[PDB]
Specification:
This is part of a larger assembly, with one copy of chain A (about 475 residues) and two copies of chain B.
Chain A: E1 3-5, E2 11-13, E3 17-19, H1 22-29, E4 39-46, H2 48-63, E5 91-93, E6 99-101, H3 104-112, H4 116-136, E7 143-147, H5 150-156, H6 166-170, H7 178-185, E8 193-196, H8 198-201, H9 222-236, E9 243-244, E10 253-262, E11 269-278, E12 284-290, H10 304-322, E13 328-333, H11 339-352, E14 356-363, E15 370-372, E16 382-385, E17 390-392, E18 413-417, H12 425-435, H13 451-463
Parallel strand pairs in A: 4-5, 4-6, 4-7, 7-8, 10-13, 13-14
Antiparallel strand pairs in A: 1-16, 2-3, 2-9, 10-11, 11-12, 14-18, 16-17, 17-18
Chain B: H1 6-25, E1 28-31, E2 41-46, E3 53-65, E4 77-81, H2 84-91, E5 97-103, E6 108-113, E7 124-128, H3 139-146, E8 163-167, E9 169-173, E10 177-182, H4 188-197, E11 205-207, E12 211-214, E13 233-236, H5 246-263, E14 268-271, E15 276-279, E16 288-293, E17 296-305, E18 310-316, E19 319-323, E20 326-330, E21 333-338, H6 349-357, H7 361-377, E22 391-394, E23 398-400
Parallel strand pairs in B: 3-5
Antiparallel strand pairs in B: 1-2, 2-3, 4-7, 5-6, 8-23, 9-20, 9-22, 10-12, 10-13, 11-12, 14-15, 15-18, 16-17, 17-18, 18-21, 19-20
Classes of the chains: A alpha/beta (about 475), B alpha+beta (about 400).
The complex binds calcium ion (CA) (3 copies).
Chain A binds four DNA and RNA strands through helix 7, strand 8, helix 8, helix 9 and strand 10.
Chain lengths: ~475, ~400, ~50
DNA sequence: AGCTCTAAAACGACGTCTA
DNA sequence: TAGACGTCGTTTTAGAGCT
RNA sequence: AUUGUACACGGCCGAAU
DNA sequence: ATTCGGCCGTGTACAAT
């Protein structure tokens, strides 16, 4: 078994600057797409305590936040601030009149409702009306932050209803998710929304767990929270923070990730997709769409014609930007590719003239692993070729971080290409490893899953509550 | 009249030896001329993989002795005392400065940062004879001096020549023949009581589609009514194991699992609810320890803990894979819990989570090595008794071009 | 010689970040903090309220 | 048995006696 | 005035020394 | 739900008897 | 019923040796 270790893929920031870490790359060169204007207007919705609380945190990040662990400065870097080393080259300001306050009576109205499902739906309607008011007026926020208060979090998440669980007496299953439902019901609004708990902008505030009532939630250090939160705010503002540095001589390729999710009843299974490709320039496009078919079932795999329509949409979306079909189409799926699926993909490519294709099943439930000698796991990027099946270590010891940011020995990915695949497993693993660093929901660059696979699952959460046939925005900013 | 004393020759030899060690590591060494003062040379780092110099320099002062013990030398460590002017000059520089002591009698080199002074003393360096050896293995640590851990965004590529890691796969040596035949029954579930009725009983057989597959001869044991004796045949294993038919693969995997279960019944026991091979406890409330070679060390497979009482047994979800026309056994370490050593411990989530959370890479590697040793030893007969049917061999050790800089991470 | 020597002066600080900035005035409070012992003793005396 | 100066070698020019 | 002999500067290790 | 991993629990699916 | 494969969903612990 021949083993290989990939060097960390190169990321692109600012004016063409390159760095292997999103946090340090942003600090040196700045965001890949500079923002026109030096202020990012952020709207805040919440109680007057939380709205004022989150407002000073944005100002606090401007002043600068010290590192939470000086021993590991690369893993837990300090937030620079508003000087020359500003990560996003812009100020996160809450402009006057861009705040909406949830009244104490409104919170008591949501809390007083007995059933958990009815309370969540009533809360979503309340917040949706406030969001509509925020965007209708002259505030014009770029991204809206929902600073949920502690009493609302207990009812909506922990299902606390005055001590006794009336909903559990009904013995219902799969309680509604407030976040997923809220994002689905506000897809028609033109401004992306961000949910923020008081734990992130206030170390003093504590939120108990849903089941372990005594225990409180544990969060990262404040500097790390600011890095991850503001990067999401910057991305949701409409500007791509960083992009994989493109090789000069590479095939124009678009990555399509395919995932599945339940149908809110726990039995049926839809398919959700994510498409990632370059923007013919410095940009990077990440779309999230649902299959337009209606072939209902419980099978975690596509059919012949349904898979064909998925590729046709992806080719068309790519063609809308580059005005030419991609040279290579890499398809990443969460389940093993079958004969009906692969022939469905091939039929779509034949109708479009795509030269090269790769059908990779990204599997996390593999018992195969390798172990070095020592107290630390193998290096991130370690690859083992197990007879046409790639054992890729997307997580592991990171020399840049100086440690391994995990809880146990990391579980590797197993890449199982289909027979109808063009690229060798060595190149496919290199592409998959690179795709893990372009997930903009966080600044830490060692993610287990590639972005198209990761984005497909995130899209499924929101689209679980979207009625079929309803046209929704394909921008990933509305889902991350 | 001109003389070159052995002291100068010894010093030059020590400098040359240190340069040779540095070049063996993979870095670059530059020797300073006559006008050197307090610095014998400069080490420049270089990436072992790409061969690209890293542009990070560090000064080196080499002191050589023909023989003679250092200050307070012992078997584990020794001590050295620096000159004050040399220390001042090293502190007023702008690059890290290391001092390397080279002993010719035993041909040893020990390096230390000149600023790594003994607590409370400015000019004492306590060299640890185990970790301060100057050789390629120390390369990463030397590189750790170049970068300032305070400033963010600065790092260094792994500078070690390579590393060695093992896989959890064990190669199976299948028997050259397999017993295939017909059977009165299409499913073995109804056939099991028929086998229980007869004399000899062994669970090393598979009934899939009215076809009987086994490694042992059905005739020689009590599996008589299970199989049509006339149609019993022995055929090359390549016609059952190494083929493309799906049900053949399923029967091969099931037969391999049952054969492993029977072969390792002395030490292990099977749990069908979780498909878990857990170390069976000998006697209720009586413990067991296992000795394996990795160098012989004991891992303590079965542990009770006081209180109400729970017994943790080491376990593995042994599975089977077919790669490149070869069969491999996959070992996945885990734990099983029993109230008294036999009856499973209900509500084991807390204990399982607590045990798994504190487990690091070294513990899992130890467990997988122990399981590999157990399965390798169980495949040996060493004769009276039938030889074990399945023999497992360790795969050749996997070589990695880069290594984790663990030696530089002792205090992160 | 003087120009060359100025290169190694390292005008940039060794990566140190200073939180505070321009400040107007300071004050203190009459309030004082209390540390408490980690043990208290309770009982039920045969008396009502210590009278 | 540790330090610490002290010997012993070499090179690099440069006053200082010593005629 | 020439011209060794000397003092001064460094490295280099190793010894007799006071401790 | 700043962020993800590991773990635990549960539901379900594909092929043949 | 089994044997082999797999997948998706909701919680806690933790910030990494
Ligand atoms: Ca997010
Ligand atoms: Ca020298
Ligand atoms: Ca020297």
């Amino acid at each position: 078994f021949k083993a290989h270790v990939f060097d960390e893929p190169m990321l692109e920031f600012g004016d063409g600057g390159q760095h292997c870490d999103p946090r340090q790359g942003l600090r040196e060169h700045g965001p890949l797409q500079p923002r026109s204007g030096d202020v990012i207007r952020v709207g805040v919705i919440g109680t007057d305590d939380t709205v004022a609380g989150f407002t000073e945190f944005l100002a606090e990040t401007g002043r600068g936040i010290e590192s939470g662990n000086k021993q590991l400065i690369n893993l837990n870097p300090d937030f620079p601030g508003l000087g020359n080393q500003n990560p996003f080259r812009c100020k996160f300001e809450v402009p006057d009149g861009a705040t909406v306050t949830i009244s104490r009576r409104q919170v008591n109205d949501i809390t007083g409702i007995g059933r958990h499902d009815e309370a969540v739906r009533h809360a979503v309607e309340l917040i949706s009306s406030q969001l509509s008011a925020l965007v209708e007026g002259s505030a014009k926020p770029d991204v809206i932050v929902l600073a949920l208060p502690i009493p609302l979090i207990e009812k909506l998440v922990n299902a606390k209803s005055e001590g006794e669980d009336s909903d559990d007496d009904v013995d219902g299953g799969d309680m509604l998710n407030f976040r997923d439902l809220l994002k689905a019901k506000t897809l028609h609004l033109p401004v992306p929304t961000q949910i923020v708990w008081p734990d992130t902008w206030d170390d003093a505030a504590k939120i108990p767990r849903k089941i372990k009532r005594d225990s409180n939630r544990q969060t990262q250090v404040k500097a790390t929270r600011a890095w991850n939160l503001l990067n999401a705010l910057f991305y949701k503002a409409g500007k791509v923070p960083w992009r994989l540095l493109p090789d000069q001589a590479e095939y124009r390729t678009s990555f399509l990730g395919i995932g599945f999710y339940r149908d809110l009843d726990g039995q049926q299974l839809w398919t959700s997709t994510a498409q990632m490709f370059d923007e013919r320039g410095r940009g990077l496009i990440l779309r999230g769409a649902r299959a337009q078919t209606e072939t209902r079932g419980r099978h975690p795999y596509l059919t012949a014609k349904d898979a064909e329509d998925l590729v046709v949409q992806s080719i068309a979306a790519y063609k809308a930007h580059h005005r030419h079909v991609p040279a290579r189409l890499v398809v990443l799926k969460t389940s093993r590719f079958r004969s009906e699926e692969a022939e469905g993909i091939d039929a779509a490519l034949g109708k479009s003239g795509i030269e090269m294709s790769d059908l990779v099943w990204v599997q996390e439930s593999s018992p195969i692993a390798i172990f070095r000698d020592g107290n630390y796991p193998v290096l991130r990027g370690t690859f083992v070729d197990l007879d046409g099946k790639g054992l890729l270590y997307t997580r592991g010891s990171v020399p840049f971080y100086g440690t391994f940011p995990g809880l146990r020995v990391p579980r590797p990915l197993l890449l199982v290409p289909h027979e109808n695949s063009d690229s060798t497993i060595l190149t496919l693993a290199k592409d998959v490893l690179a795709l893990t660093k372009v997930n903009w929901n966080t600044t830490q660059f060692d993610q287990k899953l590639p972005a198209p696979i990761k984005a497909a699952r995130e899209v499924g959460r929101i689209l679980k509550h979207v009625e079929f046939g309803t046209a929704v925005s394909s921008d990933f900013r509305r889902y991350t | 009249s001109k003389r070159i004393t052995d002291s100068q020759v010894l010093g030059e030899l020590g400098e040359t030896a240190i340069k040779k060690i540095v070049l063996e590591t993979g870095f670059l060494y530059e020797q300073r001329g006559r006008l050197e003062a307090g610095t014998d040379g400069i080490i420049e780092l270089r990436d072992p993989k790409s061969g690209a110099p890293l542009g990070k320099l560090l000064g080196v002062q080499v002191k050589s002795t023909e023989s003679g013990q250092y200050v307070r030398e012992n078997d584990n460590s020794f001590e050295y005392l620096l000159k004050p002017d040399d220390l001042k000059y090293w502190r007023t520089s702008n690059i890290p400065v290391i001092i390397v002591l080279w002993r010719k009698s035993d041909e040893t080199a020990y390096w230390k940062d000149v600023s790594d002074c003994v607590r409370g003393e400015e000019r004492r360096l306590k060299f640890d004879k185990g970790t301060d050896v100057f050789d390629p293995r120390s390369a990463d640590r030397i590189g750790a001096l170049t970068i300032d851990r305070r400033t963010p965004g600065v790092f260094l590529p792994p500078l070690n020549k390579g590393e060695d890691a093992i896989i959890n796969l064990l190669r199976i040596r299948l028997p050259d023949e397999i017993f295939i035949s017909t059977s009165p029954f299409g499913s073995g579930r109804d056939a099991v009581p028929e086998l229980v009725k007869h004399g000899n009983v062994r669970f090393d057989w598979v009934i899939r589609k009215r076809r009987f597959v086994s490694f042992f001869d059905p005739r020689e044991y009590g599996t008589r009514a299970i199989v049509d004796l006339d149609q019993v045949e022995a055929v090359d294993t390549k016609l059952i194991a190494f083929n493309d038919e799906q049900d053949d693969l399923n029967d091969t995997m099931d037969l391999l699992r049952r054969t492993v279960e029977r072969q390792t019944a002395t030490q292990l026991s099977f749990l069908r609810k979780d498909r878990l091979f857990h170390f069976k406890a000998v006697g209720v409330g009586k413990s067991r320890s296992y000795r394996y070679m990795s160098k012989v060390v004991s891992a303590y497979s079965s542990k009770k803990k006081d209180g109400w009482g729970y017994v943790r047994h080491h376990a593995a979800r042994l599975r089977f894979e077919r790669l490149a026309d070869e069969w491999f056994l996959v070992i996945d370490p885990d734990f099983h819990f029993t109230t008294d050593g036999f009856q499973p411990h209900r509500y084991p989530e807390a204990l399982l989570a607590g045990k798994k959370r504190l487990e690091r890479n070294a513990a899992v590697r130890g467990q997988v090595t122990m399981w590999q040793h157990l399965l390798v030893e169980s495949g040996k007969h060493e004769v009276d008794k039938p030889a074990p049917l399945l023999q497992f061999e360790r795969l050749p050790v996997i070589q990695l071009s880069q290594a984790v800089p663990e030696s530089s991470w002792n205090r992160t």
